[PDB]
Amino acid sequence: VKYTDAQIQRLREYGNGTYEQKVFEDLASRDAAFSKEMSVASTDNEKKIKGMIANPSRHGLTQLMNDIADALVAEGFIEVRTPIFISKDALARMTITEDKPLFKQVFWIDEKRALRPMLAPNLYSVMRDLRDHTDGPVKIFEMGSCFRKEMHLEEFTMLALGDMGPRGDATEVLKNYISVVMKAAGLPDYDLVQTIDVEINGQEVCSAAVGPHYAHDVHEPCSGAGFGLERLLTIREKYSTVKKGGASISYLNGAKIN
Amino acid sequence: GTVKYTDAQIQRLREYGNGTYEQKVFEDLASRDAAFSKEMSVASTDNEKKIKGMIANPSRHGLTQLMNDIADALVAEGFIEVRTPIFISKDALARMTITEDKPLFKQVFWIDEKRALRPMLAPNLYSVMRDLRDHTDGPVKIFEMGSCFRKESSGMHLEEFTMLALGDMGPRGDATEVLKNYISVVMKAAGLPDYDLVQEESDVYKETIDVEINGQEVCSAAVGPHYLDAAHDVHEPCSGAGFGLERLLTIREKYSTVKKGGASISYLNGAKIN
Ligand SMILES: Nc1ncnc2c1ncn2[C@@H]1O[C@H](COP(=O)(O)OP(=O)(O)OP(=O)(O)O)[C@@H](O)[C@H]1O
Ligand SMILES: Nc1ncnc2c1ncn2[C@@H]1O[C@H](COP(=O)(O)OP(=O)(O)OP(=O)(O)O)[C@@H](O)[C@H]1O
Ligand SMILES: [NH3+][C@@H](Cc1ccc2[nH]c3ccccc3c(=O)c2c1)C(=O)O
Ligand SMILES: [Mg+2]
Ligand SMILES: [Mg+2]
Ligand SMILES: [Mg+2]
Ligand SMILES: [Mg+2]
Ligand SMILES: [Mg+2]
């Protein structure tokens, strides 16, 4: 037998082991193993919190953002920051209209504005405006919170990068940007799947595309990529749920504080 | 003379310019208007040069850099950096005494009947601090940097702004002296070592110690008060402070409005891109 569904949830509350694979010969040995792993998880958790208090660090998600950002600046990307509020018109230009499944996921603030569910609308706007000021390509990125009604969080942190303007072998260039990010995040091993998706062990962590010309008749060449940063951190740190590494009032850097 | 730029001219000058236009005086309307024309061209020229420099030398964002500079200083002092949700509950607001009758309540962006965009970081920081007290007998020192939201209406006010808030529960030594010292750490790390501390009235905290630069508030801080601590199950000396990071950046970089240094689709690091 295996751990019961309820035992798995109990083990994952304080523990970050891999519990779903354990197999046992009878209920007695399952229950003995469970008691031991619960005790170890809880004590390990307590020690980890005591260590953060004794030797505080930058938050794990902030650190991951800084590691990636310094890699992208070194590659010539400008960091931008855009508003969390976006307009209904802006969503509709992303083709996010009443009929699109994503539309039902939007948090509205009033009749005309919403919490952004992705960074792309704002980033494309900023890229196009920066291209008005130069003959060369423009490469930018943003990291920030996005929101969707719902490895899913209602508030999650997206990294979005974009490259607009003259570029040769766009697809190879985009794959290299993905490499830069994944390597800077400490996740060098990953699969590319088909638009390009990045997966680790079947779990999508990025969606990227060349030429998303989805207002103007004539477009600049453009490519971009969006990464879920809590997902990357969860996979790298081997946290047993996606709720432990990001923003929380129950978890702090993988450890449960209550 | 006594003639100033008109209010509309000041707004037009500040759109692309970061000069100090409100100080200019003129003898008559003709001279005012000629100066306006000249200073508008200068402002746009200077703006274009800044944009071209940013394109030629890609960099981290100014607000992100300020956040990193302050955060590293606070971690060096033993503060834990936390990140908490932007969503908070109506009950959490009530525990801060932000209820239907209070003016700040009118400023809250509601997401549904029971949840709002946080207008301040204290509700979540109080929760995390109290839980961390369960794991130590010593001081509990935490901070968060992140977006807060208020309906506003406009000088030095944004609807979305970035607060740095810190909390210190059970400090070693006098709570007010410790608070003043951590304010000093933040302000020096921000590159703004010259500031005044001024006692100010508060609906939530009764009285705050505010950080003011040339009369402009950039931080409110408070020890307690006791009723507010006890509402969050805190029963020991406690203090905290909340800094407006865009206001700090605006003053340090001498930007002419508070809309230029933070998140924007029109401005990038003090320059207008459209
Ligand atoms: N609710 C969410 N919680 C956490 N991360 C998310 C969430 N939605 C998207 N992401 C991350 O943001 C990236 C942006 O991609 P995209 O908007 O296409 O996601 P998606 O197709 O809705 O994802 P999924 O199928 O996993 O729900 C996703 O690859 C994922 O890494
Ligand atoms: N709308 C806003 N835009 C930008 N910064 C803000 C805004 N509201 C508050 N802040 C910053 O957050 C800090 C802590 O918030 P606090 O509640 O004390 O502000 P406040 O007393 O309402 O400010 P003010 O009187 O300027 O409106 C303030 O000192 C200020 O620097
Ligand atoms: N008046 C402003 C700024 C302010 C002042 C004192 C505070 N004291 C605290 C103590 C413990 C935990 C959090 C806080 C907190 O953020 C806090 C914030 C506001 O709250 O927005
Ligand atoms: Mg989805
Ligand atoms: Mg996807
Ligand atoms: Mg106010
Ligand atoms: Mg005030
Ligand atoms: Mg104040």
- With respect to residue B264, please indicate whether it lies within any of the assigned structural domains: no
Gap between the Cα atoms of B81 and B142, Å rounded: 6
Query: In this structure, which ligand is nearest to the CA of A225?
Result: 1
DSSP-derived pairing of the beta strands B140-149 and B206-213: unpaired
Radius of gyration of chain B (CA): 21
Other residues' Cβ atoms within 10 Å of the Cβ of residue B153:
6
Radius of gyration of chain A (CA): 21
Lining ligand 1 with CB less than 6 A are: A 118, 148, 150, 152-153, 156, 158, 204-207, 226-228, 230-231
- Expressed in percent and rounded to 5, the helix, strand and coil fractions of chain A are 40, 20, 40
Report the residue among A107, A119, A158 best suited for mutation to probe ligand 1: largest number of ligand atoms under 8 A from its CB: A158
Pick from B97, B109, B110, B112: which is nearest to B158 by CA?
Answer: B109
H/E segment holding residue A87: strand A85-87
Are the Cβ atoms of B81 and A66 closer than 8 angstroms? no
Buried b (16+ CB within 10 A) or exposed e, A44-60: ebeebbeebbeebebbb
Which residues 6+ apart lie within 8 Å of A227 measured at CB?
A: A158, A159, A160, A181, A198, A205, A206
Buried b (16+ CB within 10 A) or exposed e, A113-133: bbbbbbbbbbbbbbbbbbbeb
Q: How far apart are the first and last CA of chain A?
A: 31
Q: How far apart are the first and last CA of chain B?
A: 35
Q: At A169, list the tokens.
A: 């072998």
Gap between the Cα atoms of B198 and B120, Å rounded: 21
Phi, psi (5° rounding) for residue B98? -90, 90
Place of tokens 């569904």: A5
Pick from A24, A30, A22, A136: which is nearest to A78 by CA?
Answer: A136
Q: Are B243 and B232 in contact (CB under 8 A)?
A: no
Are the Cβ atoms of A57 and B135 closer than 8 angstroms? no
Which residues 6+ apart lie within 8 Å of A111 measured at CB?
A: A88
Report the residue among B66, B108, B157 best suited for mutation to probe ligand 2: largest number of ligand atoms under 8 A from its CB: B157
Gap between the Cα atoms of B95 and A107, Å rounded: 25
Gap between the Cα atoms of A49 and B134, Å rounded: 10
Binding site membership of B165 for ligand 3 (Cβ less than 6 Å) = yes
HEC assignment per residue over chain B:
CCECCCHHHHHHHHHHCCCCHHHCCECCHHHHHHHHHHHHHHHHHHHHHHHHHHHHCCCCCHHHHHHHHHHHHHHHCCCEECCCCCEEEHHHHHHCCCCCCCHHHHCCCECCCCEEECCCCHHHHHHHHHHHHCCCCCCEEEEEEEEEECCCCCCCCCCEEEEEEEEEECCCCCHHHHHHHHHHHHHHHCCCCCCEEEEEEECCCEEEEEEEECCEEEEEEEECCHHHHHHCCCCCCEEEEEEEHHHHHHHHHCCCCCCCCCCCCCEECCEECC
Gap between the Cα atoms of B152 and B7, Å rounded: 20
- With respect to residue B159, please indicate whether it lies within any of the assigned structural domains: yes
Report the gap between the CA of B25 and the closest CA in chain A (Å). 34
Gap between the Cα atoms of B21 and B24, Å rounded: 6
Total of domains in chain B: 1
Q: At B181, list the tokens.
A: 């010292």
- With respect to residue B167, please indicate whether it lies within any of the assigned structural domains: yes
Q: Which amino acid type is present at position B96?
A: M
* Solved with: X-ray
Are the Cβ atoms of B82 and A49 closer than 8 angstroms? no
Are the Cβ atoms of A83 and B55 closer than 8 angstroms? no
A contacts of B132 (beta carbons < 8 Å): 49, 53, 257
Whole-number Å distance, alpha carbon A230 to ligand 7 midpoint, is: 35
Q: Are B202 and B220 in contact (CB under 8 A)?
A: yes
Exposed (0-12), middle (13-18) or buried (19+): which is B105, by Cβ within 10 Å?
middle
DSSP-derived pairing of the beta strands A138-147 and A203-210: unpaired
Other residues' Cβ atoms within 10 Å of the Cβ of residue B37:
10
**Which CATH number do you get for residue B86?**
3.30.930.10
Q: Are A249 and B128 in contact (CB under 8 A)?
A: yes
Q: Are A113 and A88 in contact (CB under 8 A)?
A: yes
Residue A175 lies in domain: 60-237
H/E segment holding residue A3: none
Q: Are B127 and B133 in contact (CB under 8 A)?
A: no
Which residues 6+ apart lie within 8 Å of B38 measured at CB?
A: none
Question: Residue A77 carries which DSSP code?
Answer: P
- With respect to residue B106, please indicate whether it lies within any of the assigned structural domains: yes
